[PDB]
Design a protein around this ligand. Structure first.
Ligand SMILES: Nc1ncnc2c1ncn2[C@@H]1O[C@H](COP(=O)(O)OP(=O)(O)NP(=O)(O)O)[C@@H](O)[C@H]1O
Ligand SMILES: [Mn+2]
Ligand SMILES: [Mn+2]
Length: 285
């Protein structure tokens, strides 16, 4: 069950929110590495700009990830709401964000990379299909995919998530949300979001697992791949991934076709995360 944590507990667990506990800041809020008085290894997110862009992000997580539990979603263990202070407590993911592992670190062979791809996809599919009302993440990133002790992918950061009824195809919102390099093209043309939007953002992450490069490189990534898709597809994959096995590229290309389908400019043409799961299943069979 979720747990209402005293503000004092979080205060002393992080040594007065000391800099030594700080493992991430900027944007939404600070993230601290901490150990609760019961011995739980946790991460604590201190939200800034409360009663506005901070209280909305707070509620968004409480109303979505705070109410559900899944093997491939970051667990929200607890929360704290006092005055204008808003904090969130998650279980600590040992290897941090996928972005941190992908750049700067440990080694990720393809067998574990595809398990990261399957898991994160399974997490999203759960949000889109097994949850009523449906949950739209709206900020799927490599930095918002955490890796636990087993290098299993766990989708994180529901600060900008929204609830959509199962009888609808899209949700009209107040603001444009997302991260540059991950934003679906149609999110620019309208104030409407959808699960298909999340699929696109997932595609970019799958590309990061395949190429190894940031989405921003290099003139962007999605565009450059689409162009080289008509050229030599062999000169696009991750160098360190080909050293493992050259006869595995047939599986890599099939995974790439999954990534490309997700990245279609047309939302209606994109596969659902259930289809993405089903494609992964038919690839290794
Ligand atoms: N449970 C956790 N375990 C380990 N590291 C974590 C955990 N939660 C967050 N982090 C780290 O802290 C970073 C920031 O967390 P996050 O929840 O994405 O903050 P954010 O500000 O809402 N993201 P954004 O606003 O899009 O830049 C992540 O990229 C991880 O490196
Ligand atoms: Mn984030
Ligand atoms: Mn966020």
């Amino acid at each position: 069950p979720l747990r209402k944590l005293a503000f004092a507990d979080l205060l002393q667990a992080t040594n007065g929110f000391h800099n030594d506990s700080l493992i991430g800041s900027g944007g939404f809020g600070d993230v601290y590495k901490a150990i609760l008085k019961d011995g739980s290894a946790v991460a604590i997110k201190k939200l800034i700009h409360v009663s506005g862009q901070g209280d909305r992000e707070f509620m968004a997580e409480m109303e979505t990830i705070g109410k559900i539990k899944h093997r491939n979603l970051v667990p929200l263990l607890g929360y704290c709401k006092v005055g204008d202070e808003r904090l969130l407590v998650y279980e600590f993911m040992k290897y941090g964000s996928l972005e941190d592992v992908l750049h700067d670190g440990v080694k990720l062979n393809w067998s574990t990379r595809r398990k990261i791809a399957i898991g994160s996809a399974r997490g999203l599919a759960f949000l889109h299909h097994n949850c009523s009302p449906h949950i739209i993440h709206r900020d799927m990133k490599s930095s918002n995919v955490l890796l636990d002790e087993n290098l299993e992918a766990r989708v994180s950061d529901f600060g900008m998530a929204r609830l959509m009824s199962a009888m609808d195809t899209h949700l009209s919102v107040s603001t444009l949300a997302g991260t540059p390099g991950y934003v679906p093209p149609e999110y620019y043309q309208s104030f409407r979001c959808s699960t298909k939007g999340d699929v696109y953002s997932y595609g970019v992450v799958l590309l990061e697992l395949l190429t190894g490069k940031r989405p921003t490189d290099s003139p962007n990534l999605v565009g450059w791949v689409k162009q080289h898709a008509k050229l030599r597809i062999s000169d696009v994959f991750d160098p360190e991934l080909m050293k493992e096995d050259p006869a595995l590229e047939i599986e890599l290309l099939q995974h790439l076709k999954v990534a490309v389908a997700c990245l279609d400019d047309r939302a209606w043409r994109r596969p659902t995360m259930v289809q993405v799961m089903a494609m992964f299943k038919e690839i290794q069979a």
